[PDB]
Design a protein around this ligand. Structure first.
Ligand SMILES: CN1CCC(c2cnn(-c3nccc4c(=O)[nH]cnc34)c2)CC1
Ligand SMILES: [Mn+2]
Ligand SMILES: [Mn+2]
Ligand SMILES: [Zn+2]
Ligand SMILES: [Zn+2]
Length: 456
């Protein structure tokens, strides 16, 4: 067996005027959609980006997936062509149900999915495609190539809803970021089949995600609002403790399939949707989501960060520190990079960055005063952004250091953040060196440049 489908998530049908600015639209729907975690967006009927691809020239290596509820799965980063994957996908669904591939009701695939994952006697294995755009398999949206593009492709090249453009827009905060963060700025391509699934998870740095289904059979989604994040985690901790153990890196993240009715029983609010071809799904910050594909399909997705997200991004890094979780990027480094480009930032962006920067500076000032009281006297400026990430992680909590860190000559190359000064070595703190990116005197004019830009 019995599956009680969760209630439907919100569906938006913006007019062209509403649709024209994705960021202004996302900000508008936010009071409703953040209460459900996920929402669906149907574009105006005339917004139809062109989908064209040779099925024989598009190749990918599929991932194998066992379909077992509460079984640990890794969040990752034979070879099939899009044609041979489609032939296998259709033959699988058609043989599973003994029905023509398009005649299988969605409510039946959903009930069946939840029965199959819960039955121990069922040993159903599926395949899927998951990767960033490359020369072997590129974006489903039109892109500029030095390849003559048709006027239909030109129309959708500059679109805010073309997922290649979303990261580099002026209302996006991940735009101006220098660091190599491939998995967070570049779109991901997903080739699905019946029962292929995506386990319960939240985006890196509690970012938003936007997902477009280019073509094929629907994608079923389950979403949990950001406010119920810890409530969901507490339920998952009780039922599957093995998923909550310490991991050696970001490449070793453990995720699972879990029935939304189990969450619903534990008073966790859950919403559903069937995303069809030509529809978007937006996930809000810290909103848990999972789902499965109804059949053969092709989707494209990207992470994004708005000005609304900036305080949550800082709260996320603080949360990663408490859990000893690796960061994808330094949040402080992104803030200081935006401050250094204050003259070319959007006015609303400059205003929001200034507010986060004021918190960063006050927190930093307090941390430095605490470590001076521990007896750390020696200090030296250090350009943290030049170090590879793996060379600037706190020994204790794994945070990516930017603003400051503690070093000792007895442990070359090792660093601790200011929260973990006592975790470096057994030397007295007078042997330590405070390594800092900026003095407080360098920071106040950076923040004032944002203030001038915000007031113009
Ligand atoms: N990196 C780590 C996070 C990874 C990630 C983040 N979100 N995410 C997913 N969410 C929603 C829908 C889908 C989907 O349809 N297929 C596969 N993965 C999905 C997968 C991407 C790789
Ligand atoms: Mn099973
Ligand atoms: Mn996701
Ligand atoms: Zn030492
Ligand atoms: Zn630390």
């Amino acid at each position: 067996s019995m599956f009680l489908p969760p209630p439907e998530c919100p569906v938006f049908e913006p007019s062209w005027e509403e649709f024209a600015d994705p960021f202004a639209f996302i900000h508008k729907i936010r009071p409703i959609a953040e209460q459900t975690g996920i929402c669906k967006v149907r574009p105006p009927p005339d917004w139809q980006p062109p989908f064209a691809c040779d099925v024989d020239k598009l190749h990918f290596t599929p991932r194998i997936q066992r379909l077992n509820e509460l079984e640990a799965q890794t969040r990752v980063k034979r070879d099939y062509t899009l044609r041979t994957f489609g032939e296998m996908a259709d033959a699988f669904k058609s043989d599973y149900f003994n029905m023509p591939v398009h005649m299988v009701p969605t409510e039946l695939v959903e009930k069946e999915f939840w029965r199959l994952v819960s039955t121990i006697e069922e040993d159903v294995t599926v395949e899927y495609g998951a990767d960033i755009a490359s020369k072997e398999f590129g974006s489903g949206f039109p892109v500029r190539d030095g390849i003559k593009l048709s006027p239909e492709e030109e129309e959708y090249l500059d679109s805010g809803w073309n997922l290649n453009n979303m990261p580099v827009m002026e209302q996006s905060v991940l735009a101006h970021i220098t660091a190599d963060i491939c998995g967070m700025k570049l779109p991901w391509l997903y080739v699905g089949m019946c029962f292929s699934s995506f386990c319960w998870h939240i985006e890196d740095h509690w970012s938003y995600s936007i997902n477009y289904l280019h073509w094929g059979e629907p994608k079923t989604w389950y979403g949990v609002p950001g406010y119920a994040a810890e409530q969901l985690e507490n339920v998952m901790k009780k039922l599957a403790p093995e998923l909550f153990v310490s991991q050696p890196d970001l490449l070793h993240q453990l995720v699972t399939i879990m029935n939304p009715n189990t969450l619903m029983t534990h008073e966790v609010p859950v919403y559903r949707t069937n995303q069809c071809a030509g529809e978007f799904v937006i996930t809000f910050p810290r909103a848990y989501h999972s789902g499965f594909n109804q059949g053969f399909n092709f989707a494209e997705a990207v992470n994004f960060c708005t000005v609304d997200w900036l305080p949550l991004g800082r709260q996320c890094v603080e949360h990663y520190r408490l859990l000893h979780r690796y960061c994808v990027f330094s949040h402080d480094e992104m803030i200081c990079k935006m401050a250094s480009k204050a003259d070319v930032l959007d006015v609303v962006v400059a205003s929001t960055v200034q507010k986060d920067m004021a918190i960063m500076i006050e927190d930093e000032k307090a941390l430095r005063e605490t470590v001076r009281k521990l007896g750390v006297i020696d200090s030296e400026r250090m350009d943290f952004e030049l170090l590879p990430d793996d060379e600037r992680q706190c020994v204790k909590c794994k945070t990516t250091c930017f603003m400051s860190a503690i070093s000792c000559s007895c442990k070359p190359g090792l660093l601790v953040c200011l929260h973990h000064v006592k975790e470096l070595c057994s030397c007295p703190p007078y042997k330590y060196k405070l390594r800092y990116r900026y003095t407080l005197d360098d920071l106040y004019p950076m923040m004032n440049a944002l203030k001038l830009r915000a007031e113009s």
